[PDB]
Amino acid sequence: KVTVGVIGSGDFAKSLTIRLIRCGYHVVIGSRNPKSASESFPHVVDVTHHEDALTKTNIIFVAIHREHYTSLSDLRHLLVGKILIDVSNNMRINQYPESNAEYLASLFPDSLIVKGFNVVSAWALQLGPKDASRQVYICSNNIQARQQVIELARQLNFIPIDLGSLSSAREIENLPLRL
Numbered sequence: 001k002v003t004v005g006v007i008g009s010g011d012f013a014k015s016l017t018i019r020l021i022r023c024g025y026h027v028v029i030g031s032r033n034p035k036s037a038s039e040s041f042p043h044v045v046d047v048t049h050h051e052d053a054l055t056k057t058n059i060i061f062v063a064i065h066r067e068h069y070t071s072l073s074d075l076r077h078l079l080v081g082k083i084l085i086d087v088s089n090n091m092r093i094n095q096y097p098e099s100n101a102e103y104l105a106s107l108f109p110d111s112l113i114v115k116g117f118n119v120v121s122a123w124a125l126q127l128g129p130k131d132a133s134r135q136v137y138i139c140s141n142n143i144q145a146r147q148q149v150i151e152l153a154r155q156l157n158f159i160p161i162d163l164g165s166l167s168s169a170r171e172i173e174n175l176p177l178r179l
């Protein structure tokens with residue numbers, strides 16, 4: 001089984017982990033408190049500290065909020081070359097001078113940041129997306145990483161919508177707030 005990483009242990013990390021397992025992946029979780037977080041996951045999931053989880057996979061969902069990204073900054077060297085999937089949303093349209101994905105890319109300039117899955121609710125990961133809204137919008141400045149995340153979306157039974165460069169991340173982040 002291919003191993004996919006998730007940082008964080010909240011509602012989104014838990015739902016993502018469900019879908020990943022159902023779709024045939026092995027999951028490693030990076031948590032600040034893995035002994036405590038382990039009870040929030042099945043035994044088949046490897047729950048560990050961030051620095052250990054990162055050694056087990058090259059593709060990591062960053063299932064934490066933007067305001068906590070800098071808690072990972074000391075992992076910069078270990079994260080070099082890895083794909084980081086920015087799943088985040090904000091409470092306001094155009095909330096910051098840069099999109100959350102661009103902010104993450106600036107914190108980890110030698111990682112490969114891909115925006116994706118922010119439009120998917122926790123409940124949609126558990127039940128599946130509505131038949132008329134299986135779309136997940138994906139973008140990245142790195143074409144190879146973009147294509148890997150597109151293929152992951154397909155394996156998770158979503159319809160990936162390739163919006164090209166990371167410049168698309170801003171309006172992808174605005175989309176849940178628009179109607």
Ligand SMILES: NC(=O)C1=CN([C@@H]2O[C@H](COP(=O)(O)OP(=O)(O)OC[C@H]3O[C@@H](n4cnc5c(N)ncnc54)[C@H](OP(=O)(O)O)[C@@H]3O)[C@@H](O)[C@H]2O)C=CC1
Nearest residue numbers: 008009010011012031032063064065068071088089118122
């Ligand atoms: N909930 C949803 O339905 C959806 C959420 N998202 C996005 O997913 C991401 C997570 O959302 P959600 O699960 O609801 O968020 P939570 O508020 O549950 O936070 C998730 C994780 O953040 C981690 N973390 C929290 N504080 C810190 C910190 N100070 N430093 C380092 N890590 C920290 C915790 O992990 P730990 O304690 O294990 O370290 C926690 O389990 C967000 O970006 C959200 O916008 C996207 C679409 C849907």
